[PDB]
């Protein structure tokens, strides 16, 4: 019923050579990297307890994935006919997808653990239940990768004059569930093993970054302004509370209690909590941000800046009126053009600097360096570093595993049995699959190295680890 091809199924020898080189390099480098990670974790008995066990599980998944995926695909590219038997035809995809699941789940859980270790307002602590979590990860991985070991089989055929022994997921199946699995395996993999953890870790990372922004601006304004839980009359002669939250310009302390209760949602009697002050400060921050974007003098400057410099500008808009910050047309010009040091020297000459030198110096340092170094302590900074490293790792994953999934999706979406010259697309997909294997093994190889990349602790570990 389907006509044959005038064009053959072929792979150019140039791609064969270059891809074998790439695959061999990836294999050796990944073996070495994951083995060294495991060795330094094994010799590190003091840090054996902690989140290091998730690194151990991730490296184990990486090493297993490399060991199973690289040589068999090298052989499939070279010998183009395999003698290992239906035992291996069922065994290989099983362990392969099990290792894929181990890697995915362990990396996602590491990123979630890093979101947990940085945040506040948490539980008691991580200590013990994460090992049961490792058992769950490996068990769910092995269970999910079972339809692979059930549906694969070896078939033979006489093709254009040759007796071929093909190992594949059988296009016809005994179970009705296995038929649906053969139909939608690529969709299942693309959703669960790629889209799901990518989106979950992206949600967690966005949550973490917003939480960090709020807590850091709270720390900054606490240091610069001051935290008072009881009503007081500020310098300009008006009642306020919290972190400089004006209640009313009218001289009635009772009419100020009225507005305070109207804001907090309870009978306060002029006294609030540290966390209620934090919620009110978040409300004030959001109100300032919304007002700034309605000021044509301040809106493009705000839209130009990053998060930390936005927070410094919000600090300034807290201290002085919105029009007061609008009165800095020169320094705002320099900040919008990202001329940091010149804006610093121009702000250090203002009246605002001379009246409030401490706050001015810290805000100007924030503008120049673009960091929270003036306010926060080093524990928070190391936590941020580690979290951002793990997130960059999930990004490396999401970009390395995309081509293989996309090649499978293209095979599912564009193949038409009736086309005579479809074998062009077939050879194309062959090259794409042999490239996607390399990309996946490259991610699972660079996990330890890319962890070394943007983390000082793992840079030190990579420096020290040598022979044994």
């Amino acid at each position: 019923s389907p006509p044959p091809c005038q064009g053959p199924i072929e792979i150019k020898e140039t791609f064969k050579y270059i891809n074998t080189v790439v695959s061999c390099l990836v294999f050796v480098l990944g073996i070495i990297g994951n083995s060294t990670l495991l060795y330094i974790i094994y010799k590190n008995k003091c840090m054996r307890n902690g989140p290091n066990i998730l690194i151990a599980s991730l490296a184990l998944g990486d090493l297993l994935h490399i060991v199973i995926a690289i040589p068999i695909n090298v052989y499939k590219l070279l010998a183009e006919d395999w003698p290992f038997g239906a035992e291996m035809c069922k065994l290989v995809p099983f362990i392969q997808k099990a290792s894929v699941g181990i890697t995915v789940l362990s990396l996602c859980a590491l990123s979630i653990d890093r979101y947990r270790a940085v945040a506040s307002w948490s539980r008691i602590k991580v200590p013990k239940w994460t090992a049961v979590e490792i058992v769950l990860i490996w068990v769910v991985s092995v269970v999910l990768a079972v339809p692979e070991a059930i549906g694969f089989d070896i078939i033979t055929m006489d093709y254009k004059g040759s007796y071929l022994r093909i190992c594949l997921l059988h296009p016809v199946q005994k179970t009705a569930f296995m038929q649906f699995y053969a139909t939608a395996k690529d969709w299942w993999l693309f959703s669960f093993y790629f889209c799901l953890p990518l989106a979950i870790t992206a949600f967690f990372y966005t949550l973490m970054t917003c939480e960090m922004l709020r807590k850091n601006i709270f720390e900054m304004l606490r240091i610069d302004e001051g935290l008072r839980l009881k009503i007081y009359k500020d310098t300009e002669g008006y009642y306020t509370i919290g972190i400089g939250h004006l209640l009313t310009k009218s001289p009635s302390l009772n009419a100020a209690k009225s507005e305070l209760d109207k804001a907090i949602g309870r009978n306060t009697n002029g006294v609030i909590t540290k966390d209620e002050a934090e919620k009110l400060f978040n409300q004030d921050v959001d109100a300032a941000v919304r007002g700034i974007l309605r000021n044509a003098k301040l809106k493009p400057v705000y839209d130009s800046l990053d998060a930390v410099r936005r927070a410094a500008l919000i600090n300034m808009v807290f201290q002085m009126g919105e029009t007061g910050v609008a009165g800095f047309t020169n320094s705002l010009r320099m900040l919008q053009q990202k001329r940091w040091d010149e804006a610093a020297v121009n702000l250090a000459k203002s009246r605002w600097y001379n009246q409030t030198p401490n706050r001015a110096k810290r805000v100007i340092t924030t503008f120049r360096t673009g960091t929270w170094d003036a306010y926060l302590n080093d524990h928070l900074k190391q936590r941020r570093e580690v979290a951002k490293t793990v997130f960059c790792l999930v990004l490396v994953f999401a970009l390395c595993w995309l081509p293989l999934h996309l090649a499978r999706i293209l095979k599912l979406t564009l193949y038409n049995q009736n086309d005579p010259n479809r074998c062009e697309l077939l050879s194309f997909l062959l090259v794409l699959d042999y490239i996607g294997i390399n990309m996946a093994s490259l991610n699972s190889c660079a996990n330890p190295i890319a962890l070394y990349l943007v983390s000082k602790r793992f840079k030190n570990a990579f420096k020290s680890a040598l022979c044994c």
Binding site: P2, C5, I72, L168, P171, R408, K411, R422, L426
Partner: peptide, 21 residues
């Protein structure tokens, strides 16, 4: 890989040459 049915020999030869995934 897989194919829709066994009637297509070209996709079978593909999965003979294809990677194992």
């Amino acid at each position: 890989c897989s194919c829709k049915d066994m009637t297509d020999k070209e996709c079978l030869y593909f999965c003979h040459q294809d990677v194992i995934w």
